[PDB]
Structure 1
Amino acid sequence: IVCHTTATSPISAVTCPPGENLCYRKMWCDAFCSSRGKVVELGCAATCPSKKPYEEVTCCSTDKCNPHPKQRPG
């Protein structure tokens, strides 16, 4: 499927490979949880693995189902 990926400088959403049909969205109190925090690494995936205690990636089985918690251009 397609899921927003922050891989690129800007923001966008492409169709994962023939190995991922899900969608994720990392998150962690970045080095600025004070103002920023929670780094969403929008992207795609075939599922949701273990994950870290601080750095966790969401999961979904639909396109644009793992958007940003602040989605917005510029």
Structure 2
Amino acid sequence: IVCHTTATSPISAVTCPPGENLCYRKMWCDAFCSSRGKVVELGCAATCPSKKPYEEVTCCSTDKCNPHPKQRPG
């Protein structure tokens, strides 16, 4: 599967061959609650933790399944 991981210059999509292929799309506050915007980090894990005590953390294990609300394949 592929993974829209926000890591390099643009959204860098990487295919995780091993067992860990889960695409997480977690979010918290990165100036939105402050001034700019919310936090968005997309990666490829094996066990996406459910950190919903304040940060919106989603878990999807499918090719390019971790796209964010602000920017996405338009």
* Normalised TM-score (structure 1): 0.71
Whether the aligned pair in 2 keeps the contact of 1:26 and 1:56 (CA below 8 Å) is yes
Any runs of at least 4 consecutive aligned residues in structure 1 with deviations exceeding 4 A, and if so which? none
**How far apart are the structure 1 equivalents of 2:41 and 2:17?**
17
**How far apart are the structure 2 equivalents of 1:20 and 1:51?**
18
Whether the aligned pair in 2 keeps the contact of 1:40 and 1:69 (CA below 8 Å) is no
Whether the aligned pair in 1 keeps the contact of 2:31 and 2:38 (CA below 8 Å) is no
Alpha-carbon distance, 1:60 to partner: 0.6
**Residue aligned with 1:51, SS:** coil
Equivalenced residues, count: 74
Whether the aligned pair in 1 keeps the contact of 2:26 and 2:55 (CA below 8 Å) is yes
**How far apart are the structure 2 equivalents of 1:71 and 1:49?**
23
Is there any run of 5+ residues in structure 2 with no aligned partner, and where?
none
Q: Select the structure that is richer in strand.
A: 2
Q: 1:14-45: per-residue Cα shift (whole Å, max 9, x none)?
A: 11251412111120121233664321101212
Is there any run of 5+ residues in structure 1 with no aligned partner, and where?
none
**RMSD of aligned alpha carbons:** 2.9
* Normalised TM-score (structure 2): 0.71
